[PDB]
Design a protein around this ligand. Structure first.
Ligand SMILES: NC(=O)C1=CN([C@@H]2O[C@H](COP(=O)(O)OP(=O)(O)OC[C@H]3O[C@@H](n4cnc5c(N)ncnc54)[C@H](OP(=O)(O)O)[C@@H]3O)[C@@H](O)[C@H]2O)C=CC1
Ligand SMILES: NC(=O)C1=CN([C@@H]2O[C@H](COP(=O)(O)OP(=O)(O)OC[C@H]3O[C@@H](n4cnc5c(N)ncnc54)[C@H](OP(=O)(O)O)[C@@H]3O)[C@@H](O)[C@H]2O)C=CC1
Ligand SMILES: NC(=O)C1=CN([C@@H]2O[C@H](COP(=O)(O)OP(=O)(O)OC[C@H]3O[C@@H](n4cnc5c(N)ncnc54)[C@H](OP(=O)(O)O)[C@@H]3O)[C@@H](O)[C@H]2O)C=CC1
Ligand SMILES: NC(=O)C1=CN([C@@H]2O[C@H](COP(=O)(O)OP(=O)(O)OC[C@H]3O[C@@H](n4cnc5c(N)ncnc54)[C@H](OP(=O)(O)O)[C@@H]3O)[C@@H](O)[C@H]2O)C=CC1
Ligand SMILES: COc1ccc2c(c1)N1C(=NC(N)=NC1(C)C)N2
Ligand SMILES: COc1ccc2c(c1)N1C(=NC(N)=NC1(C)C)N2
Ligand SMILES: COc1ccc2c(c1)N1C(=NC(N)=NC1(C)C)N2
Lengths: 249, 250, 248, 250
């Protein structure tokens, strides 16, 4: 049988490109989504049209709460229900917005930003490992976490925690043959709600080509990490940032 | 008048040594505690014998919940109510125990390890900065071994990495207000008193510099430096106080 | 027609695996050697038999000296001469031995800083000067921050190479030249070291209690040079099976 | 008696500030210099006038060459000759200039000066200080911006990265001897004498904490901390003193 992968937040943008690319490599895919039901189901349709019965969707809020462990278990369970196995987990879903230190409550900001970026990854990792060829997890990190955006403390804390998870799970799961690695974009597909001038400000900072990464360029590093060419790599985070993190103020 | 500092988890061990050294330096202190009321009050009584009206206690759970923000606001408020100002915040309180990937529920483990080590620090930092109305700083107790973690301590390790991110993010964001934000990262310091000496020795033997753990006071010394006038240009820095432990390969 | 790569210290071990894998991916290659002529020629023969006139050999000492500049120019030149282009430079060659704080010291600097850092820097200069998917790959070390006792100079050289990786990535990005690193933990162990000492290292590795093969190291090199890494520069990929995550 | 320190490149700027602060703390000092003979002697004159027979000068080129080991040995010997002991080594001297990759001095000279002053001389001086052997320590002057370097400064960047490696490797290997090895990493401190005010202000405006460069004294304060008994458990640590500069994205 073909191996199977879960990609969180896979209806759009980078998560979609990862799902597409995994599928093109031979994987059956679980397309996790939160709000993007139309685009989720649309992507599965496209993949299934190419090879029947190779894509399912699975809906879940990855906000932190007392029921997040059950939702994460359910995402993994979905892969086993549809495909009888789960070889690859891609932790891609992410909330991203400012939380200044000085209309959501602070408790909601914490639950969303830390839940999606860190807690849900951890719980999905636990469920993935409990339910267990070439098994591996890839976490979508952030190349700029040590030169953060102003007023993004909770997002930055989340992505730092995700680095911690990447290392800790790599150490602990290596005895089970499960590798755990990260891919750290710099600027890739820029937000929908961002203006053109602000987009171009960011592009101009990238040494390699003065432009953002394509979604596909990020996916390429994910593909490498899950491949048979990365069988001795665990606990590594690959920056895919065109040099951006090298540039001083 | 005299500056004031809040120290979380200050009843015992490292937090205690930090509160004492701040007080000896001339600070009035809030001693935050969770369970150790008797130790907290004993310390407050000792410090107040040294100088009257210079130390208060403040009880709070720092586990993540819907009431954590209000708790953190109250902790900061307690310093203002007692001393009329809050110059220094030391994020010291920390939960620490294994959370294997493969008798608390997992959601409890999350709330306690991420709440104490990361979220409560964030919410304390927010309340600290919001309430500012000379030499303001925050010091976060980090962990020098976070890139070489103990097996099965993922949630602990996640919380302490998050604390690094908070240190950096808040240093950048609070710099325009003149508030510095730094960390101190112990390697092996005070081990649990009930841990067998033969187990304590396994750790001590790994430390290059003197084959011994840091005392609480040695950790406090770095905190004192960071809050001092000798560190007025330092922000976003994390000082390892680890006797070279983090340099030793497997 | 086909792209061309220089690999330093390519006659044996990791550099040979890198050369072969590059060849099999369809590069023409320059096999650089210092002492290992026989091995270099043997490799070139094996490759040429596969695809005619696609591998050449190049001698140079990479010890630092007043002639290192010219040596490095020569290595790059020989690629332009054999193949009319030079698409990839792999800085693999390297010296390794203890230099206790408590060979003259200056020979040790020239070997340990020269081969590990200064020659990569001079080769990088000649590579860029003489300029598609152009990239440079430097062989770093995953254990730089938890170093072996009494290996100061070696560790200095490998830290310098990290610095070169970053600095050259920034400076050459304008020319579309990518600059990246691959950092082995324990791979092929030194021929010299005890078999008992070897197993002591194997046992520390989380992923499989074993060293990386040379080919696993090359696999990462191949990724970085490929079209699949066209946005990657200034990145160092550890290939260490988790070794650097293990505490004392 | 009083302890003694060697400070390299101590005639002016940050190195003088370190030698001055060490002297005020009660150290005897060797003022190493290369070209700045007048300024070095002037400083030793000031310090001797404060306390007689507490300061000497010592000339040496720290460019790499076959005699650099002897020059480094002689620097350390000068301290023992003058004061009968050597307790602290501060590796401060540094060459700094562009070395573009795509393109005065021959490249071989650039390598000698930039790698020699920033890394090889620190290594040889460390070797001599340890071999020649309380509170012994070495403090290396590093650079907070080594991971976000200036364009066209490969060789300088290489040398400062090697100096981090030295700090770590030496801390590990010398810990059994009770010698601590740490670093201080400025971001922008005293700007070059040659830089125009306009360009200086461009750098100043990037610093979060105050939009100004560090004073030489602020850099010295962190050095003083690392050598002090307040840092007795610290080895292998590099303290950034950069007002948050390294946290600022492009
Ligand atoms: N794009 C870039 O430049 C950079 C991206 N990255 C990282 O790469 C990854 C992919 O980036 P990108 O595609 O831009 O990400 P997006 O910002 O587009 O978010 C990805 C998906 O996350 C899902 N998500 C958000 N909140 C929740 C929630 N509460 N519960 C469940 N799912 C949720 C959304 O699902 P739905 O739409 O179904 O609601 C969304 O489509 C992320 O981890 C990001 O942090 C890092 C650095 C730079
Ligand atoms: N000791 C060491 O070797 C090392 C320590 N560190 C860090 O240094 C700091 C101090 O270390 P140490 O003194 O050993 O810490 P402890 O493990 O002794 O914990 C300090 C205090 O944290 C408080 N705390 C625990 N859980 C909670 C909670 N849910 N709510 C509120 N407070 C809570 C406790 O207060 P109470 O007693 O009142 O309940 C406790 O006394 C910590 O941040 C730790 O992670 C880092 C690396 C190593
Ligand atoms: N193997 C491992 O476990 C690890 C490897 N690495 C790095 O990986 C790379 C490859 O490692 P490995 O294959 O073990 O390396 P080796 O130690 O086998 O050296 C590789 C080649 O370097 C060449 N070389 C040595 N000194 C000189 C010199 N003065 N002038 C010119 N060439 C010279 C030699 O070529 P010749 O034979 O022609 O004389 C030699 O075959 C190195 O950069 C190394 O530091 C890093 C960490 C661990
Ligand atoms: N100032 C800043 O903004 C920053 C400084 N730093 C580091 O802090 C330290 C102090 O900086 P700063 O005071 O500006 O340093 P300077 O640039 O002023 O140089 C210090 C001394 O280095 C000596 N020196 C230079 N070349 C040689 C050589 N070949 N042999 C021997 N000595 C030599 C010179 O001594 P002489 O005059 O006697 O010839 C000079 O006075 C340095 O290590 C530097 O790299 C790091 C980042 C920023
Ligand atoms: C300012 O450019 C960035 C910079 C960093 C980014 C980022 C965008 N993203 C990040 N995560 C998520 N989830 N979405 C977006 C908003 C696209 N990280
Ligand atoms: C195994 O020795 C360590 C190693 C790391 C430690 C640690 C103890 N501690 C940590 N945090 C907290 N809160 N308490 C204790 C148990 C003292 N980190
Ligand atoms: C441009 O600001 C910097 C930034 C980094 C600097 C630096 C100056 N210096 C450095 N080293 C030496 N030796 N002198 C000077 C030129 C003052 N590092």
């Amino acid at each position: 049988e073909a191996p199977a992968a879960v990609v969180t937040g896979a209806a759009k943008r980078i998560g979609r490109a990862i799902a597409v690319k995994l599928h093109q490599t031979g994987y059956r895919v679980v397309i996790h989504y939160h709000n993007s039901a139309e685009a989720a189901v649309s992507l599965a349709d496209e993949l299934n049209k190419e090879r029947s019965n190779t894509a399912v969707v699975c809906q879940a809020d990855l906000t932190n709460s007392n029921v997040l462990p059950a939702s994460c278990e359910e995402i993994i369970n979905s892969c086993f229900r549809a495909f009888g196995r789960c070889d690859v987990l891609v932790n891609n879903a992410s909330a991203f917005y400012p939380t200044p230190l000085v209309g959501k409550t602070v408790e909601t900001q914490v639950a969303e930003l830390i839940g999606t970026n860190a807690i849900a990854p951890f719980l999905l990792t636990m469920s993935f490992a409990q339910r267990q060829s070439n098994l591996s997890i890839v976490n979508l990190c952030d190349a700029m976490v040590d030169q953060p955006c102003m007023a993004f403390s909770l997002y930055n804390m989340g992505k730092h925690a995700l680095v911690g998870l990447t290392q800790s799970a790599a150490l602990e799961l290596a005895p089970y043959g499960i590798r755990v690695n990260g891919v750290a974009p710099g600027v890739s597909l820029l937000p929908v709600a961002m203006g053109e001038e602000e987009k171009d400000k960011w592009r101009r900072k990238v040494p390699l080509g003065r432009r953002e990464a394509s979604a596909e360029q990020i996916a390429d590093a994910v593909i490498f990490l899950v491949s048979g060419s990365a069988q001795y790599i665990t606990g590594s985070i690959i920056k895919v940032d065109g040099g951006l993190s090298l540039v001083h103020a």
